[PDB]
Amino acid sequence: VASYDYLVIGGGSGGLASARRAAELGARAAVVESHKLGGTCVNVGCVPKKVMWNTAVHSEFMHDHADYGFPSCEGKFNWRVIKEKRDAYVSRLNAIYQNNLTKSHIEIIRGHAAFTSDPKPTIEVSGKKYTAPHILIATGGMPSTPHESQIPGASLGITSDGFFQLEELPGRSVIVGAGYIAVEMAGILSALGSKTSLMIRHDKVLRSFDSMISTNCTEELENAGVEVLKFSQVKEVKKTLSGLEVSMVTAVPGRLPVMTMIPDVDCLLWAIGRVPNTKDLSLNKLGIQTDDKGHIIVDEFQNTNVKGIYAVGDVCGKALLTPVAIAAGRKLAHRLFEYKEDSKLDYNNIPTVVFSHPPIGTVGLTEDEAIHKYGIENVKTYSTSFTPMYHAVTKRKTKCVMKMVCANKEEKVVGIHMQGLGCDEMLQGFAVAVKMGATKADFDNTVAIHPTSSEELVTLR
Amino acid sequence: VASYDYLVIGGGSGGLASARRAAELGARAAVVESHKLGGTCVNVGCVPKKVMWNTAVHSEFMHDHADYGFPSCEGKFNWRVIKEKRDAYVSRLNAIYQNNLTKSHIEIIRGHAAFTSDPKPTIEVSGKKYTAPHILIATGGMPSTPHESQIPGASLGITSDGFFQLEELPGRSVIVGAGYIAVEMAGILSALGSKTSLMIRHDKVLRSFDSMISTNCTEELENAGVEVLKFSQVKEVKKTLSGLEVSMVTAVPGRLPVMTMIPDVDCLLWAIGRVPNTKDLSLNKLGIQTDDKGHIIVDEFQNTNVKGIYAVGDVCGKALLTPVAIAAGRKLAHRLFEYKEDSKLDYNNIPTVVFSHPPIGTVGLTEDEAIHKYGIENVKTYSTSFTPMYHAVTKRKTKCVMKMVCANKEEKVVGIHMQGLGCDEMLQGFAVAVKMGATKADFDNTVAIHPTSSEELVTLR
Ligand SMILES: Cc1cc2nc3c(=O)[nH]c(=O)nc-3n(C[C@H](O)[C@H](O)[C@H](O)COP(=O)(O)OP(=O)(O)OC[C@H]3O[C@@H](n4cnc5c(N)ncnc54)[C@H](O)[C@@H]3O)c2cc1C
Numbered sequence: 001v002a003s004y005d006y007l008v009i010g011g012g013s014g015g016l017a018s019a020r021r022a023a024e025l026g027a028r029a030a031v032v033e034s035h036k037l038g039g040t041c042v043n044v045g046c047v048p049k050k051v052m053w054n055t056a057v058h059s060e061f062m063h064d065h066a067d068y069g070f071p072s073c074e075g076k077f078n079w080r081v082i083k084e085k086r087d088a089y090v091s092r093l094n095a096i097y098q099n100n101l102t103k104s105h106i107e108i109i110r111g112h113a114a115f116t117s118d119p120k121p122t123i124e125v126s127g128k129k130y131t132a133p134h135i136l137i138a139t140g141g142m143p144s145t146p147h148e149s150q151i152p153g154a155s156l157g158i159t160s161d162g163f164f165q166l167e168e169l170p171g172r173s174v175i176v177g178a179g180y181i182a183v184e185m186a187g188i189l190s191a192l193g194s195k196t197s198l199m200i201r202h203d204k205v206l207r208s209f210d211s212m213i214s215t216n217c218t219e220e221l222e223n224a225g226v227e228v229l230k231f232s233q234v235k236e237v238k239k240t241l242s243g244l245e246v247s248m249v250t251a252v253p254g255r256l257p258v259m260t261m262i263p264d265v266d267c268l269l270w271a272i273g274r275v276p277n278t279k280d281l282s283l284n285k286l287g288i289q290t291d292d293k294g295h296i297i298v299d300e301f302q303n304t305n306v307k308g309i310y311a312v313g314d315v316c317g318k319a320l321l322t323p324v325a326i327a328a329g330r331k332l333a334h335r336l337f338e339y340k341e342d343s344k345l346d347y348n349n350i351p352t353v354v355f356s357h358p359p360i361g362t363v364g365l366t367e368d369e370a371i372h373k374y375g376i377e378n379v380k381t382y383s384t385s386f387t388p389m390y391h392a393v394t395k396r397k398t399k400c401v402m403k404m405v406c407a408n409k410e411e412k413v414v415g416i417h418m419q420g421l422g423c424d425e426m427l428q429g430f431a432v433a434v435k436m437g438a439t440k441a442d443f444d445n446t447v448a449i450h451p452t453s454s455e456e457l458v459t460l461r
Numbered sequence: 462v463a464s465y466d467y468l469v470i471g472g473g474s475g476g477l478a479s480a481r482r483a484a485e486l487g488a489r490a491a492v493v494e495s496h497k498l499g500g501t502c503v504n505v506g507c508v509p510k511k512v513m514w515n516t517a518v519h520s521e522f523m524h525d526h527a528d529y530g531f532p533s534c535e536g537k538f539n540w541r542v543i544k545e546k547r548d549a550y551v552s553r554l555n556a557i558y559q560n561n562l563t564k565s566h567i568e569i570i571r572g573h574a575a576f577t578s579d580p581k582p583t584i585e586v587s588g589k590k591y592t593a594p595h596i597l598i599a600t601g602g603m604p605s606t607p608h609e610s611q612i613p614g615a616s617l618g619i620t621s622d623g624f625f626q627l628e629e630l631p632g633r634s635v636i637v638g639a640g641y642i643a644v645e646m647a648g649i650l651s652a653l654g655s656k657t658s659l660m661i662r663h664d665k666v667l668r669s670f671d672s673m674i675s676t677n678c679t680e681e682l683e684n685a686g687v688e689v690l691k692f693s694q695v696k697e698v699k700k701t702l703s704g705l706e707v708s709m710v711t712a713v714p715g716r717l718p719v720m721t722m723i724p725d726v727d728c729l730l731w732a733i734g735r736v737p738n739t740k741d742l743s744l745n746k747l748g749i750q751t752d753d754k755g756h757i758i759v760d761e762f763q764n765t766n767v768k769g770i771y772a773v774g775d776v777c778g779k780a781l782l783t784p785v786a787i788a789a790g791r792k793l794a795h796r797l798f799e800y801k802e803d804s805k806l807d808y809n810n811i812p813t814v815v816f817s818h819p820p821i822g823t824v825g826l827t828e829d830e831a832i833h834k835y836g837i838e839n840v841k842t843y844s845t846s847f848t849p850m851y852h853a854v855t856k857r858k859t860k861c862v863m864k865m866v867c868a869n870k871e872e873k874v875v876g877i878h879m880q881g882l883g884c885d886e887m888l889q890g891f892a893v894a895v896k897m898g899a900t901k902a903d904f905d906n907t908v909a910i911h912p913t914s915s916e917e918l919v920t921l922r
């Protein structure tokens with residue numbers, strides 16, 4: 001029964017971040033990891049995804065080579081080549097990662113962890129038990145797959161975790177979901193050559209994002225050659241001779257339902273949401289609160305319903321982004337160990353980029369979210385649509401949409417949403433302005449950087 | 462002797478902008494243009510330059526095709542193809558441009574204009590004379606070429622104006638200058654295949670920019686295969702059998718001068734600065750003030766040393782950017798016609814992007830400029846250098862540098878300078894923040910957008 005100042009459950013983005021900051025503050029932390037250190041983030045998340053996104057962008061620009069005065073470019077494309085490099089890059093960083101964690105004198109407890117049936121702050125990792133007045137739950141989540149009970153054959157399809165294990169380009173791809181992980185994957189596969197289909201329960205993807213984004217993204221997916229199967233759900237799946245057959249039902253309002261058999265699918269990817277890893281923590285044994293989906297409940301300070309126990313990251317279910325986990329984990333360390341009874345993460349105005357094609361950028365409230373918080377009368381929105389001049393010479397095209405959500409007489413910028421070339425690297429700066437409480441005037445008093453797309457944001461009329 | 466409310470001299474970026482805003486305010490404007498409406502901006506500036514920049518970027522990314530899992534791409538590249546399209550795009554916009562100017566009921570006086578020898582507000586355009594209580598000088602500037610007196614054979618070399626008239630890719634290129642127009646041109650030519658040399662009077666380019674940028678840009682030019690001829694000047698030029706021979710003198714401190722003959726140059730481009738078009742306005746005939754280089758002097762309100770006469774744009778010599786001309790021209794219209802005795806352009810924190818490879822972004826003071834304004838003790842700077850993960854799988858590389866200049870206890874962000882992938886579209890947002898008076902804290906309280914380069918700006922330690 002060893003004892004530490006800080007005991008972290010889950011050695012990934014949030015856990016490590018928080019633990020490391022603690023030891024930096026003096027605390028003697030001990031993080032527990034059951035698998036690879038770095039969680040979803042490193043291994044099957046962010047980077048490997050960005051690399052794959054880059055490869056896809058490259059592929060697109062190459063459909064432009066000729067347009068740009070060059071002789072046509074082949075396009076065979078070898079997945080195994082990029083995969084190899086991706087794995088290299090990962091472990092390459094992963095090595096540096098480890099080095100740091102190592103020099104942070106943080107003990108790494110190996111094995112699955114769960115809270116036992118004791119009252120004093122303790123969890124049991126493979127027999128042995130550990131205690132600490134402060135215990136953090138940063139076990140993250142996982143890709144959600146349907147039960148054979150619900151959809152027979154469901155285990156035939158993979159998830160984003162499988163996506164990064166793929167060694168070849170699926171000839172025929174089917175992705176089920178409407179979130180960013182789904183949109184992102186369909187984007188890459190399609191760009192890289194797979195005959196891709198995206199199956200969504202409704203008529204547009206990213207429905208939680210602003211209406212303009214949802215509508216525009218769906219249209220771009222289509223223009224890019226991604227078959228968007230609207231108002232469709234997978235009723236059953238099974239292995240055929242040439243791969244997989246997917247039976248889906250399409251229920252378009254104003255139309256009668258219809259069954260369709262999708263044949264020769266080289267692989268199905270489930271991208272229907274993430275599930276928090278809490279089912280084996282045996283939380284109840286301490287009364288740690290959770291919602292019905294399993295997320296650990298917390299207050300503005302990442303405090304669980306039980307003293308001396310906290311939670312940050314995907315496990316909490318709000319804002320599933322590695323930076324949010326990082327920030328939350330650190331602020332906590334500062335509160336618990338630097339004694340800053342105010343150290344806490346502001347979840348408002350967290351900027352997000354969805355790596356679609358072109359990328360999506362967003363921060364602040366959606367128009368609809370604004371209307372509810374301020375009132376229809378107190379909300380004006382500006383927006384523009386245009387074709388990046390990069391496509392001025394291209395047969396192939398993609399537009400750019402921008403929307404600015406303003407509130408009150410002062411027209412405070414409470415929301416910024418956009419999709420288009422560059423937007424992935426264009427948002428960070430504006431997010432900063434938005435968190436300072438920028439106004440439409442603040443944007444308009446800023447001289448435009450011509451010629452770029454970014455300048456359109458400070459010239460919205 | 463017709464009379465108008467607003468008479469504009471020069472129908473380009475600033476003139477048109479200002480005039481158009483005036484008529485929008487009621488004023489009956491009449492702009493005078495001696496050549497093509499749109500000035501340097503449209504015809505031989507911004508867009509045609511960006512197009513050419515894009516083509517070059519494309520060319521670079523194509524040196525990566527194989528790295529990114531694709532079979533090698535040829536690379537012949539046909540300049541005439543892009544040129545044709547560029548010309549198309551230009552006139553295509555140029556058409557829209559005209560449409561607007563037309564529906565703005567602004568009379569366009571054709572012909573060269575200059576102030577006569579009268580006291581009442583009047584200029585003479587091809588015989589006829591025109592008057593107005595408010596007259597704007599927006600004649601812009603022009604590329605500077607040396608005299609045969611100074612450098613014999615100088616007329617053999619072209620300027621940026623010639624660059625956009627080129628129908629082929631010069632096999633061997635030599636560009637003289639250290640400014641952005643010089644750096645930009647060398648970048649494109651080199652990227653597109655020309656064996657390029659950049660001749661600079663000193664050891665680095667963009668010496669007016671921050672030290673980090675100057676140093677980094679020069680190194681990138683070199684890595685990209687651009688021969689940077691340091692401490693060299695063109696002493697003489699002449700046409701040989703295989704093109705042109707350039708005689709230059711290299712004067713490296715700590716070393717003895719040396720003459721070098723550069724042979725087989727397919728074309729020399731002078732990019733040594735811009736000259737304001739005022740020498741034929743016969744300004745003196747009214748006592749309109751100018752500096753020794755010819756720029757028209759003005760106050761914070763674009764007022765010349767003579768009532769009823771103003772000037773905005775390159776002709777004034779400060780901040781030679783189409784947006785600055787636009788902004789200045791409009792604010793003036795608002796002052797003179799909306800009667801806003803405060804309507805004036807803030808020249809502080811004007812953001813600028815230099816389209817090098819990778820692009821350069823900047824706003825605010827340079828570290829050295831900060832030290833002088835606040836004092837060494839009151840200035841701390843943050844900076845980071847790294848390789849965009851886009852190059853994680855590329856043999857070819859380019860780094861990314863970022864520098865944040867802070868002043869006082871509060872660490873107010875007074876300067877932001879960077880070079881790297883995306884920076885061209887990454888700056889606008891941060892400029893906005895910077896003009897609001899952002900602090901290092903304002904940046905740091907903003908959640909990072911991972912994984913991007915932009916996030917490095919809000920995580921500088
Ligand atoms: C395909 C994909 C792409 C993504 N792209 C992005 C992106 O571009 N930008 C972005 O910001 N976010 C992205 N994310 C999300 C980001 O990776 C996560 O938000 C972040 O990793 C969550 O942090 P976490 O601390 O919860 O860690 P993980 O979710 O990183 O959790 C940490 C560790 O907990 C361990 N663990 C679980 N249970 C136990 C236990 N009982 N005992 C011990 N250890 C345990 C796990 O094994 C894991 O290694 C992406 C995710 C996916 C799946």
Ligand SMILES: Cc1cc2nc3c(=O)[nH]c(=O)nc-3n(C[C@H](O)[C@H](O)[C@H](O)COP(=O)(O)OP(=O)(O)OC[C@H]3O[C@@H](n4cnc5c(N)ncnc54)[C@H](O)[C@@H]3O)c2cc1C
Binds near residue numbers: 471495621776
């Ligand atoms: C290669 C190159 C690239 C550039 N790239 C960029 C860039 O990326 N971003 C940026 O912001 N800026 C860029 N610029 C600069 C930008 O184009 C200028 O700052 C802007 O055009 C200046 O505005 P202006 O109003 O002075 O017009 P011009 O300088 O546009 O002036 C307007 C007109 O005055 C007319 N005129 C002159 N004398 C007379 C007379 N006596 N009577 C009547 N008419 C007269 C001219 O014929 C001209 O058409 C670039 C310039 C060059 C050369």
Ligand SMILES: c1ccc(-p2c(-c3ccccn3)c3c(c2-c2ccccn2)CCCC3)cc1
Binds near residue numbers: 158266
């Ligand atoms: C070649 C290409 C894809 C597979 P994918 C794959 C999977 C994907 C990534 C990592 C691990 N497993 C998996 C399956 C695949 C599938 C797709 C069509 C027909 C049969 N199987 C089926 C069961 C779950 C794992 C197998 C061989």
Ligand SMILES: c1ccc(-p2c(-c3ccccn3)c3c(c2-c2ccccn2)CCCC3)cc1
Binds near residue numbers: 623705
């Ligand atoms: C093919 C390629 C370049 C020229 P460039 C060119 C020029 C460039 C653009 C537009 C107009 N003129 C010009 C010259 C050129 C030059 C370069 C090397 C040897 C001789 N001439 C020489 C005089 C000024 C105009 C002529 C033929």
Ligand SMILES: [Au+]
Binds near residue numbers: 040041045
């Ligand atoms: Au991550």
Ligand SMILES: [Au+]
Binds near residue numbers: 158170266267268
């Ligand atoms: Au598969």
Ligand SMILES: [Au+]
Binds near residue numbers: 501502508
């Ligand atoms: Au321009």
Ligand SMILES: [Au+]
Binds near residue numbers: 619631727728729
């Ligand atoms: Au030439």
Ligand SMILES: [Cl-]
Binds near residue numbers: 035036
């Ligand atoms: Cl590991």
Ligand SMILES: [Cl-]
Binds near residue numbers: 496497498
């Ligand atoms: Cl014209």
Ligand SMILES: [K+]
Binds near residue numbers: 013041
């Ligand atoms: K990480």
Ligand SMILES: [K+]
Binds near residue numbers: 474502503783
């Ligand atoms: K223009």
